[PDB]
Amino acid sequence: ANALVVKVSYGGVLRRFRVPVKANGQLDLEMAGLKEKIAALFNLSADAELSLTYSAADGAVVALVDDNDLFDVTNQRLKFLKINVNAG
Ligand SMILES: [Cl-]
C-alpha cells in the first residue's frame, strides 16, 4: 500500500508520477503501461523504440527492455526510480 515514486526525464524536463505496488511488493505496472504513460507526458509514440534507463547504486546503468527489468525494480526494494528517456 506504498507506491513507487517514478521520475522521468526527457528533453531537459522532469516529470513525477506514482505507481501502486501489490501486497507482493510487485509494481502494478508493465512495460506497455509505462511506455504509454511516458508517451502521454511528453507527446511521444507509445510504440516508439525508446531507451529507458536508470543509474543503479553500483554505478552501472540499467536498461528497461522487458517486464523482468521492471519486476526487478521491486525485487530490489527501490522506492524511487529516476528514468532517463532517449529516443532513436
Ligand atoms: Cl525531484
Residue numbers in the entry: 5 to 92
Paper quotes:
PB1 domains are protein interaction modules with critical roles in the assembly of protein complexes involved in autophagy, signaling, cell division, and redox processes, as well as the auxin-response pathway in plants. PB1 domains form homotypic interactions via conserved electrostatic motifs molded by basic or acidic surface patches on opposite faces of their ubiquitin-like β-grasp fold. While type A and type B PB1 domains can form heterodimeric protein complexes, type AB members can mediate interactions with either PB1 domain type or engage in homotypic interactions to form homo-oligomers or hetero-oligomers. Our cryo-EM structures of filamentous p62 and AtNBR1–PB1 assemblies revealed that the presence of a tandem arginine sequence in the basic motif of type AB interfaces is required to stabilize a polymeric assembly.
In the absence of prior structural information, we traced the AtNBR1–PB1 de novo. This de novo-built model is in close agreement with the 1.6-Å crystal structure of a polymerization-deficient AtNBR1–PB1 mutant, which we solved in parallel. To validate our structural interpretation, we performed pull-down experiments using MBP-tagged wild-type AtNBR1–PB1 as a prey and a series of AtNBR1–PB1 interface mutants as bait. All interface mutants decrease binding significantly compared with the wild type, and binding is completely abrogated in mutants lacking the double arginine finger, in agreement with observations in cellular assays.
